[PDB]
Amino acid sequence: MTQLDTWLANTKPLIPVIVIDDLVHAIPMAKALVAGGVHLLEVTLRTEAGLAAISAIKKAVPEAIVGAGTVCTADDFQKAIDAGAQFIVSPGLTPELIEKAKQVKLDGQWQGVFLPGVATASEVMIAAQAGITQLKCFPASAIGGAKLLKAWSGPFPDIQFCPTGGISKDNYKEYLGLPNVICAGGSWLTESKLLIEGDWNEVTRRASEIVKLSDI
Amino acid sequence: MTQLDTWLANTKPLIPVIVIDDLVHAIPMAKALVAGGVHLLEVTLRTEAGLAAISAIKKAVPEAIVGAGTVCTADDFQKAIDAGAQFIVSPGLTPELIEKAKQVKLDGQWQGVFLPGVATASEVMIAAQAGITQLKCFPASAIGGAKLLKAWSGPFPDIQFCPTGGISKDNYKEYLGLPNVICAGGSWLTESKLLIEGDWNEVTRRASEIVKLSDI
Amino acid sequence: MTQLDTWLANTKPLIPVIVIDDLVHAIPMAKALVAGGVHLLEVTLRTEAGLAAISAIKKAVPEAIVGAGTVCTADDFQKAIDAGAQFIVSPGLTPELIEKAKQVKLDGQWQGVFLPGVATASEVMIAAQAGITQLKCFPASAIGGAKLLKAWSGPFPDIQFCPTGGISKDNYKEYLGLPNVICAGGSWLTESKLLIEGDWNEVTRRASEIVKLSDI
């Protein structure tokens, strides 16, 4: 078992991919998500409030496992670690990201989980050989979806995936049912309107409707 | 604004992907295309007459912006520049192409536009980090199409694309309407039969039917 | 003509992608396949019996052309060569595999065929520039299939492909009919049940139903 496996054994298999404009929404949003049993929170660096939001959730909502997404560069990677990210998700993987991740693991100060995107068998093999065997498949739905993941299970049976990209309320359970899929990223729990309006009851409702892995 | 942006603000958003067997067809073809308001001409190096065709159009049709496509190697890249290509399109990107492009930009003699193909989030990130933020998506239609481009807009909102591959009269406007799409490559304006028969009126007709970006 | 071309001119265009649990099934399986006119046998390294199965077939069934698949690392590559593999198939390609293949070709002792997976135009161009012009497309059916291969024929007209992944009795002939497709990998000839039960007549039947390339 990895660190990611251990977290996933204690929360729901659905990672909200969070786009948050206002820092002040971070804590209530996260509190609303954990209240519905959803603890692995990926705050993307797609807004200026992203990093600050991580730090705020980290401090104020110790039960959430808060991470950074849309980490594209080594500098993004370092800033996530400084903000207090417990995990880092990237949409793809480059030699510069591989190098950065190795280096922070070598220094031993950040012991979090790096979860990078792959989209081809060759990308999988490059990530696996850098030592990363749990990968994001991005953007899963547009690039072949369940069929792609299933085809990859044959030659790569020890690699596990988190598909992200076009995962929905209506198809997430099908992805999760794949034997090489351990979790999925989804956007619908933290839609923009919900955050701007502070509709924390609806966020909690959407989280509470997510099923545990053993219940698919 | 890039050089490409500046050209596109002054012509139609459709780049003919040209396969030309006979040098003698180059000038009348290009004259037929500009007469229909289509100025960005990608002459692929898929025939022996390709390079010569570029040079001929460059000299004789100063209003066309003439480029090279199917540039696969550094040597292809250099020969395009010697032929007088104003832009270079490649179906994919390699370290050797990245290196070549850097080197000609460093030498400062060729100030044209390099527009390379990407097909995965990781390929985008590698091109963007070499300094290229306007990319070909190839072959767009077979690898996930509008859905793929839209999914990529989330993590890569500052990258713009030119989809090529299965763009048609019937779907180009849908691609162009994507906020991260600035232009598209298409084959139908310069079909083989039209060139071999010298049917310049039909070429001009096909070009004139292309709509400006503001008119989709 | 390549070595692969020469083999394919003398057998059926269908490469069984073999998953074999028990060493003892290797010889009768292979004998059943050649009896149906199917000689290019890819024994994947997805089971512990994989390597041994290669060696057994190599010795006992000299008319089969026996290879290794699911070669992911340089060490997998070397072990295949030691087992007696005549060809090596990998699901993707990495710098470490490129390097290994160069090095065994430089040493001149293994003169077999390396057939690596590609899934993007950029992957093709990287393999072609290492000197490999006959490639696996993997997993062909989930990543755009016949349409993808056809789109690639335009810029890469001298590259030939073996699609593998979701090739079936019902669609293999369509893949084979593509001018840039020379053969295909399929799983249905050596299904698990057939091997475990020793149903060699059915294996031979499935092989005998495969058509020669000139008969599509």
Interatomic CA distance for residues B160 and B179, integer angstroms: 8
- CB burial string B150-182: b at 16+ within 10 A, e below: bbbbbbbeebbbbbbbbbeeebbeebbebebbb
- A43 DSSP β-pair partners: A18, A68
Secondary structure in 3-state letters for A82-129: HHCCCEEEECCCCHHHHHHHHHHHHHCCCCCEEEEEECCHHHHHHHHH
- Greatest distance between any 2 Cα atoms in chain B: 47
Which residue in chain B has the smallest CA separation from A167? B151
Q: What is the DSSP letter of B31?
A: H
- How far, in Å, are C9, C124, C182, C189 from residue C1 at the CA level? 10, 20, 12, 28
Query: Token pair for residue B204?
Result: 């001009």
Please give the single-letter amino acid code of residue C176: L
Secondary structure in 3-state letters for B116-174: EEECCHHHHHHHHHCCCCEEEECCCCCCCHHHHHHHHHCCCCCCEEEECCCCCCCCHHH
Query: Token pair for residue B21?
Result: 């067997």
Query: Across C6-154, where does the E strand assignment appear?
Result: 14-18, 40-44, 65-69, 87-90, 113-118, 134-137
Gap from A159 CA to chain C (nearest CA, Å): 13
Phi-psi category of residue B70: left, alpha or beta, with phi > 0 → left and psi -120 to 50 → alpha = left
Gap from A154 CA to chain C (nearest CA, Å): 8
CB C42 within 8 A of CB C17: yes
- A88 DSSP β-pair partners: A68, A114
The helix (run of H) or strand (run of E) holding residue A17 is: strand A14-18
Supply the DSSP string of A33-60, one letter for each residue.
HHHTT--EEEEETTSTTHHHHHHHHHHH
Q: Do A165 and B151 touch (CB under 8 A)?
A: yes
Q: What is the DSSP letter of C92?
A: S
Residues in chain A: 216
CB A183 within 8 A of CB A13: yes
C122 touches chain B (CB under 8 A): yes
CA B6 to chain centre: 15
Q: B70: closest CA among C150, C137, C160, C157? A: C157
Q: Which of B123, B165, B166 is facing C122, going by the closest CB pair? A: B123
Q: Which residues, 6+ apart, have CB-to-CB distance to C54 below 8 Å?
A: C43, C66, C67, C68, C80, C83, C84, C85
Interatomic CA distance for residues C16 and C23, integer angstroms: 17
CB B46 within 8 A of CB C154: yes
Q: Do A154 and C46 touch (CB under 8 A)?
A: yes
Q: B118: closest CA among A119, A69, C17? A: A119
Q: B8: closest CA among B197, B181, B195? A: B181
Q: Which residues, 6+ apart, have CB-to-CB distance to A195 below 8 Å?
A: A20, A21, A22, A25, A29, A203
Q: What is the DSSP letter of C14?
A: E
Please give the single-letter amino acid code of residue C155: P
Over the Cα atoms of chain C, what is R_g? 16
Gap from B118 CA to chain A (nearest CA, Å): 12
The helix (run of H) or strand (run of E) holding residue C28 is: helix C26-35
Residue A81: count other Cβ atoms within 10 Å of its Cβ: 18
Phi-psi category of residue A159: left, alpha or beta, with phi > 0 → left and psi -120 to 50 → alpha = beta
CB B138 within 8 A of CB B117: yes
Report chain A residues whose CB lies below 8 A from the CB of C93. Answer: 122
Supply the DSSP string of C50-75, one letter for each residue.
HHHHHHHHHHH-TTSEEEEE---SHH
At residue C165's C-alpha, the angle toward residues C164 and C170, to 5°, is 90
B73 touches chain C (CB under 8 A): yes
Residue B73: count other Cβ atoms within 10 Å of its Cβ: 17
Residue C193: count other Cβ atoms within 10 Å of its Cβ: 8
- Greatest distance between any 2 Cα atoms in chain A: 47
* CATH superfamily of the A2-216 domain: Aldolase class I (3.20.20.70)
Residue pairs spanning B and C at CB distance below 8 A = 57
Q: Which of C122, C126, C148 is facing B139, going by the closest CB pair? A: C148
Please give the single-letter amino acid code of residue C130: A
- How far, in Å, are A3, B31, B86, B89, B167 from residue B12 at the CA level? 53, 15, 17, 18, 15
The helix (run of H) or strand (run of E) holding residue B16 is: strand B14-18
Resolution rounded to one decimal, in angstroms: 1.8
| Number of helices (H), then strands (E), in chain B | 10, 8
The helix (run of H) or strand (run of E) holding residue A65 is: strand A65-69
- How far, in Å, are B66, B115, B120, B130 from residue B162 at the CA level? 16, 9, 14, 18
CA A181 to chain centre: 13
Q: C200: closest CA among C14, C63, C52, C38? A: C38
CA B46 to chain centre: 14
Interatomic CA distance for residues C89 and A166, integer angstroms: 32
The helix (run of H) or strand (run of E) holding residue A160 is: strand A160-163
Q: What is the DSSP letter of A62?
A: T
Unique residue bearing structure tokens 């080197």: B103
Interatomic CA distance for residues C166 and C145, integer angstroms: 9
Which residue in chain B has the smallest CA separation from A95? B126
| Number of helices (H), then strands (E), in chain A | 10, 8
Query: Token pair for residue A94?
Result: 């480059």
